[PDB]
Structure formats: C-alpha cells, structure tokens
C-alpha cells in the first residue's frame, strides 16, 4: 500500500449515492445503493428517482452518479489520487456542456460515512431545450466505452479531467456531453498527485424487472492505464 486511503479498498465496499437536482426548474432526487471493489475495478449500483419520473435521461447522469473504485495496476498505485484522499474524501465538481443544448453544473462530496462510501451530489441544469435530446428523452438506454484522461492540478492539490461522452440518439445521431472536471481533497492530509494517465471505462445499463419506480441498474468497470512503469 502507498497511501493510508488505499487500505480502505482491499475488499468490497458498500456505496450510497444521493443526488438532488434541478433541470430548467424541474426538481428531482435520485438515491443509489450497491457496492464497489477497486481490486477488480467493478461497481454495481441500482438508482431510483425518489420524486417520480426522472425529467432527464438516465444515461446523462451516469458520470455524475465514485472513481476511488478504479482499478489502479500495481505499477500505478502512486498515481491514485482518489483513494489517497480517503477517508476524509474529495470534492468532485463538473460542468457538463450538452452540444447545442443545456449545461449541468455538479458538486459532489465522495467520502466514507461509517463503513459506507457516499457520493452526495447537487446538480443544477440550465438552458435545456424543451424539444432537445435531453428534456425530450431521445437518448438510447445504453452507454459507450470511453477513456478519460487524468492530470494533476498542483494549485488545487488535486486532479482535473476534460472529456466528451457520446450519447446515442434514437434517430441514429450522437449527442455530445463535454465534461470539465476538478477534484480537491476535503481533508488536510497528504494526497498523491499523479503523472498523466487515463481511465478506461465500460458501463452496462439495465432494468430490474420487479422495480416499478423509474430506475437504472448500472454495472461499471474502470481501470487505470497509460503509465510505462511506476
């Protein structure tokens, strides 16, 4: 182990996710539960919309709804910022610009509460078009595999990332979601600032046949790569 935080991820860890959202004034909430295992890079989560119908497509919230569960290979352990911030945790902030449509602004705290890894999120969505791909629910219930590049932010004592997500549209087009991300430690403790690398992601979206509430079952594998050795 090369951080104190890394010791908290040697096994399966239960997860709680809480989002409070407002998109074009439509207020909604989501809660998720499941578990993460950073030893194999695997997350399993089930999310419900606690307020009724989700006013945005579930795929648009996948990135917002725990990168501490990324599998960092043995040779890359000194580049794992996310676990190094634990248990105090980190703030994850994004701007998500939907091409030709509105913007999500997010702020999340990811930290241990008890033995649970908690991701608690506020989301504000602005300038969405009523007849767009988002408020119109024109996005396919699926999710493309993606590489996300991680850089150190020495000033903020954390990391930053920009990346584009490609959401398939029912009419065969693609809706781009341009992500700008920064992560900053909550705690005063020392953290690992990484060399340039990327995270390889794969997300499978499904439904619980016994679940009548508006919901998303998520299986996510995230693996770090891109460092030649060390």
Q: Where are the domains of the chain?
A: 5-225
Nearest-angstrom CA–CA distance, 102 and 200: 27
Task: Give the angle 79-83-88 at the CA atoms, nearest 5°.
Answer: 135
- Exposed, middle or buried: residue 165 (CB in 10 Å: 0-12, 13-18, 19+)? buried
Give the residues across from 135 on adjacent strands.
none
Q: With contact defined as beta carbons under 8 Å apart, do 57 and 142 qualify?
A: no
The coordinates were experimentally obtained by X-ray
- The two beta strands, 215-225 and 116-126, are unpaired
Q: With contact defined as beta carbons under 8 Å apart, do 230 and 212 qualify?
A: no
Nearest-angstrom CA–CA distance, 52 and 29: 9
Determine how many CB atoms are found less than 10 A away from the CB of residue 146: 18
Phi and psi torsions of 224, nearest 5°: -80, 150
Q: Quote the distance between the C-alpha of residue 101 and its chain's center.
A: 21
Nearest-angstrom CA–CA distance, 81 and 67: 9
For 150, the 3-state DSSP assignment is: strand
Nearest-angstrom CA–CA distance, 90 and 129: 33
Between the CA atoms of 21, 204, 170 and 55, what dihedral angle is there, to the nearest 10 degrees?
A: -20
Expressed in Å, this structure's resolution amounts to 1.6
Nearest-angstrom CA–CA distance, 189 and 89: 10
- Exposed, middle or buried: residue 96 (CB in 10 Å: 0-12, 13-18, 19+)? buried
- Exposed, middle or buried: residue 100 (CB in 10 Å: 0-12, 13-18, 19+)? exposed
For 147, the 3-state DSSP assignment is: strand
| Neighbour-count burial for 190-209, b at 16+ CB within 10 Å, e otherwise | ebbbbeebbbbbebebeeee
Nearest-angstrom CA–CA distance, 221 and 90: 21
Between the CA atoms of 85, 91, 97 and 101, what dihedral angle is there, to the nearest 10 degrees?
A: 140
Q: Which residue has the tokens 């248990």?
A: 87
Nearest-angstrom CA–CA distance, 56 and 153: 32
Q: What is the DSSP letter of 71?
A: B
Span 5-225 CATH architecture: Beta Barrel (2.40)
Output 70-73 pairs: Cβ under 8 A, ≥24 positions apart: 70/38, 70/41, 70/199, 70/222, 70/223, 70/224, 71/38, 71/39, 71/40, 71/41, 71/221, 71/222, 71/223, 71/224, 72/38, 72/224, 73/223, 73/224, 73/225
Those residues with Cβ within 8 angstroms of residue 74's Cβ, 6 or more apart along the chain or in another chain: none
Q: With contact defined as beta carbons under 8 Å apart, do 85 and 185 qualify?
A: yes
E strand spans, 132-214: 146-153, 158-168, 174-185, 197-206
Nearest-angstrom CA–CA distance, 70 and 37: 8
Please tell me the chain's helix, strand, coil percentages from 3-state DSSP, rounded to the nearest 5: 10, 50, 40
Nearest-angstrom CA–CA distance, 147 and 153: 19
């Amino acid at each position: 182990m090369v951080s104190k935080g890394e010791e908290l991820f040697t096994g399966v860890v239960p997860i709680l996710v809480e989002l409070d959202g407002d998109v074009n004034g439509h207020k909604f909430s989501v809660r998720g539960e499941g578990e993460g295992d950073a030893t194999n890079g695997k997350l399993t989560l089930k999310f419900i919309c606690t307020t009724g119908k989700l006013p945005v497509p579930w795929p648009t919230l996948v990135t917002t709804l725990v990168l501490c569960f990324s599998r960092y290979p043995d040779h890359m352990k000194r580049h794992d910022f996310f676990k190094s911030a634990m248990p105090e945790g980190y703030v994850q902030e994004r701007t998500i610009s939907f091409k030709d449509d509105g913007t999500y602004k997010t702020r999340a705290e990811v930290k241990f509460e008890g033995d649970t890894l908690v991701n608690r999120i506020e989301l504000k969505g602005i300038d969405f078009k009523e007849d767009g791909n988002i408020l119109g629910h024109k996005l396919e219930y699926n999710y493309n595999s993606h590489n996300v590049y991680i850089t150190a932010d020495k000033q903020k004592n954390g990391i930053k990332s920009n990346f584009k997500i490609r959401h398939n549209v029912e009419d065969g087009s693609v809706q781009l979601a341009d992500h700008y991300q920064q992560n900053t430690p909550i705690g005063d403790g020392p953290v690992l600032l990484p060399d340039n690398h990327y995270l390889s992601t794969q997300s499978k979206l499904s439904k619980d046949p016994n679940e009548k509430r508006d919901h998303m079952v998520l299986l996510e594998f995230v693996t770090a790569a891109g460092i030649t050795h060390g």
